[PDB]
Amino acid sequence: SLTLFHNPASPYVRKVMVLLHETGQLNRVALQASQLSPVAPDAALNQDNPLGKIPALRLDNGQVLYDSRVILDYLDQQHVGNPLIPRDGSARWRRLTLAALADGIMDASVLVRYELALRAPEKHWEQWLDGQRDKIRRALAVLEAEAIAELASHFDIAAISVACALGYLDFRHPDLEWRQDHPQLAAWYFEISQRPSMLATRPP
């Protein structure tokens, strides 16, 4: 069977968990708990993913896949349902670009979390923090437009990725109050939060 390095905070892990739920493949995956940060290595994880990041997926044959987008691609090709990642043509490119937009939000969000929670306050750099927050805000604006119609078309790779990014803002960055100025996105997210796969994968 498969083994996924996991913890319930990670929104990248959450993408994987949501895809597993949606595709009926939770039964294939043992969870290996990991607590970690860039200054607190997990030695067991590092033996499998030298980058020291989660998610990482150990296959039945012992090979390891990372990062999250590689794992999601692998898992999407294992089931016979409709794919969550379009296999060809225009949709493939469009939906993977929205997924990358969402990953960029997560990347900035995690960096701001680590600076605020781990770095000594006297070493915080406010202009850096605000630059990351502004990159998140600009991406949210594009998502507001996408929430008009494109986002809701399918609960697929793009929708999962965006949903996990918004859930992570709620969890670690409520001060960004993303709903206040993004009502269309707020409505979309309120709906997709009720999906069983989202309810089962919320952070602590």
Ligand X SMILES: N[C@@H](CCC(=O)N[C@@H](CS(=O)O)C(=O)NCC(=O)O)C(=O)O
Q: Exactly one of 12, 155, 188, 189 binds ligand X (CB under 6 A); which one? A: 12
By a kind-dependent CB cut-off of 5 to 8 A, residue 70 interacts, out of its own copies, ligand X, none, with its own copies
How are beta strands 29-33 and 2-6 bridged, if at all? parallel
DSSP symbol at 8: T
Sheet holding 64-65, edge to edge: 29-33, 2-6, 57-58, 64-65
Residue 77 contact partner, candidates ligand X, its own copies, none, CB within 5 to 8 A by sort of partner: its own copies
135 labelled as ligand-binding? yes
Q: Does 119 bind its own copies (CB under 8 A)?
A: yes
Note whether 3 binds ligand X by CB under 6 A. no
85 is in an annotated binding site: no
Comparing C-alpha atoms, which of 71, 90, 196, 104 is closest to residue 150? Answer: 90
* Nearest by Cα to 95 from 84, 109, 107: 84
Residues 16-55 that bind ligand X (CB under 6 A): 36-38, 52-55
Query: Residues annotated as binding site for glutathione?
Result: 10, 54, 68, 114, 135
